[PDB]
Amino acid sequence: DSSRASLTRVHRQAYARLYPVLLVKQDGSTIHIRYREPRRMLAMP
Amino acid sequence: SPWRLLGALCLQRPPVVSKPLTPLQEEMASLLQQIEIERSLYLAQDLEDMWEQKFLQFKLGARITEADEKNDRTSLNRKLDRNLVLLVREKFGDQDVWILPQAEWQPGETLRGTAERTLATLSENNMEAKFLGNAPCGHYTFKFLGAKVFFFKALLLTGDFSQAGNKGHHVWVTKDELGDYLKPKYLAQVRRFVSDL
Amino acid sequence: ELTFEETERRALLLKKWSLYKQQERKMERDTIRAMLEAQQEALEELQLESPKLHAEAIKRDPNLFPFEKEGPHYTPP
Amino acid sequence: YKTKPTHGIGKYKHLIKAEDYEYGVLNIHLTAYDMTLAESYAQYVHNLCNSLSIKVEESYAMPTKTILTTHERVVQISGLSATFAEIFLEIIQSSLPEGVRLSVKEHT
RNA sequence: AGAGUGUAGCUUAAAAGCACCCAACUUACACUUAGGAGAUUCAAUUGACGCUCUGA
């Protein structure tokens, strides 16, 4: 059960649009992140 | 009375891949997205095209490496969305039952030491496991001369499971094959303390 | 602005999600109680069959203070 | 009145606390790419704690650090039993949604 | 094979009260407001469908 609190949202009122950008740190582990300007793919050199 | 001292260990491989979202969760995903755009507070086309083609050029690693094998029960990667449990066939002098990895312990060795020994007793590998406490998770007693079996719990951090084609019959069971492989009540109730999730 | 049909769909969405997460929490609690009572009966049997091991069954491993374990991902290495 | 049987019927302060191997102070650190996911996981773990009757003291957050940003949360825990701690942290292990970093560090 | 037997999680409650959950206010919890699901195992006090224990 690793999805019960994944369908959750920000509970504030001052904020801009957030998008599900896929991110990889160093080894190819794609994870959704709430990030501006949807890139759909991120990689740290 | 003569007592047969026996321990064991119900190893836990955690799911490296999160479970896929159900259509119910996806509908709630749409609802949460649209409420966000409702409750938010304030050449892009070229950037969007470049970013989408950057997304397309690299292929995402398959979340399910399971549909291709269909027979790699000995492989550590049999399942990814759920936890896995080690389970090795054993053949006794008077019995032949698909039994969770057991071990023999002496009063000079504590239960944690027995579990640590069992970690590498039967897998002959360099697996890395972690224990939480001395508390067991299941106790099952079958007599012929008393006897007992203590199913302990441990979690896999990393595993160098060399020579995967071992002479044993280690089959990773998540939840379903438990009953199929372990018939008697003393062994089919492992699901009570195995995290079904 | 919004419409009656989508409002009704949203209300039914809330209803079905209430039911679904109610079942989720019920099964989680069932597992909690099942394995807690399993551990309690295991400890009781250990006390009955070994008077010198229940004393060391309650002690705590000192290696859990710097505990570490990563969560799930999508693309394994 | 002192000499009557009803003496002390109104005293209340003794009911208010205005002030066996067990753990110490436990800090669970949750650093996550998403403010949303970090907050949701903090809520879930707090709900588990107050449903299992665990003394929770603080649920604050560390200041943000930039090097994108990672949001940090803290959960304080005090009071565990032998089997209870095992169940608690195994449940935490099994119910980690996606790419979250747990911790069982202590104070200071 | 035998015993205890039996209202949703609990009730020397008789279809109820506590429990329980999400939504909003909360960092968070809590409170509060809005909503949600829930049972007397089946046949005539009795017999037999399910759980626990005692054995093999």
Which domains are delineated in chain A? 1-45 (6.20.130.20)
Polymer length in residues for chain D: 108
Q: Is D37 on the interface with C (CB under 8 A)?
A: no
Helix locations, B129-196, DSSP H: 177-181, 185-188
Q: Which residues of A are less than 8 Å from D43 in CB distance?
A: 5, 8
> Based on the structure, what is the number of domains in chain C?
1
User: What's the CA D7/C1' E44 distance, rounded, in angstroms?
Assistant: 60
DSSP state of B134: S
Would the CA dihedral through B163, B168, B169, B175 be positive or negative?
negative
Neighbouring residues of C61: CB distance < 8 A, sequence distance ≥ 6: B112, B131, B132, B133, B134
Q: How far is Cα D9 from Cα B13, in angstroms, rounded to an integer?
A: 59
| R_g (Cα) of chain A, nearest Å | 12
Q: Is C38 on the interface with B (CB under 8 A)?
A: yes
A13, B27 contact by CB (below 8 A): no
Alpha-carbon separation of residue A27 from A23, A42, A44, B61, B146 (angstroms): 11, 12, 10, 11, 52
Range(s) of the domain holding residue C21? 1-77
Q: B137: which 2 tokens?
A: 């998770």
Instruction: Give the nearest partner residue to D104 out of C39, C57, C67, using CB atoms.
Output: C67
Q: Is B25 on the interface with D (CB under 8 A)?
A: no
Asked if the Cβ of residue A4 lies within 7 A of any atom of strand E, the reply is no
D69, A34 contact by CB (below 8 A): no
Q: How far is Cα A33 from Cα D1, in angstroms, rounded to an integer?
A: 68
Q: How was this structure determined?
A: cryo-EM
What is the domain partition of chain D in residue ranges?
Answer: 1-108
Q: What are the DSSP E strand ranges found in B13-95?
A: 88-91
Would the CA dihedral through B161, C77, B152, B149 be positive or negative?
negative
Alpha-carbon separation of residue B98 from B122, B139, B147, D45 (angstroms): 15, 17, 18, 37
Q: Which residues pair with B98 in a beta bridge?
A: B89
HEC string of chain C?
Answer: CCCHHHHHHHHHHHHHHHHHHHHHHHHHHHHHHHHHHHHHHHHHHHHHHCCCCHHHHCCCCHHHCCCCCECCECCCC
Q: What CATH number should be reported for the domain holding residue B126?
A: 3.90.79.10
Give the neighbor-by-neighbor strand order of the sheet with A31-35: A31-35, A19-24, A42-43
Strand E, nucleotides covered by protein (CB < 7 Å):
20-30, 35-37, 56
Helix, strand or coil for residue C7?
A: helix
Rounded to 5°, the CA angle B196-A2-B8 comes to: 35
Q: Is D39 on the interface with A (CB under 8 A)?
A: yes
Q: How far is Cα D97 from Cα D85, in angstroms, rounded to an integer?
A: 20
Pairing of strands A42-43, B6-12: unpaired
Alpha-carbon separation of residue B163 from B74, B124, B129, B166, B167 (angstroms): 10, 9, 18, 6, 9
Q: What CATH number should be reported for the domain holding residue C23?
A: 6.10.250.3440
Q: C10: which 2 tokens?
A: 């949203």
Q: Tell me the angle at which helices C4-49 and B23-39 cross, rounded to the nearest 10 degrees.
A: 120
Residue of chain B whose alpha carbon sits nearest to that of D97: B18
C28–A29 C-beta distance less than 8 A:
no
Burial class of residue B187 (count of CB atoms within 10 Å of its CB; 0-12, 13-18, 19+): buried
Asked if the Cβ of residue C15 lies within 7 A of any atom of strand E, the reply is yes
Q: How far is Cα B176 from Cα B105, in angstroms, rounded to an integer?
A: 30
Range(s) of the domain holding residue B187? 72-196
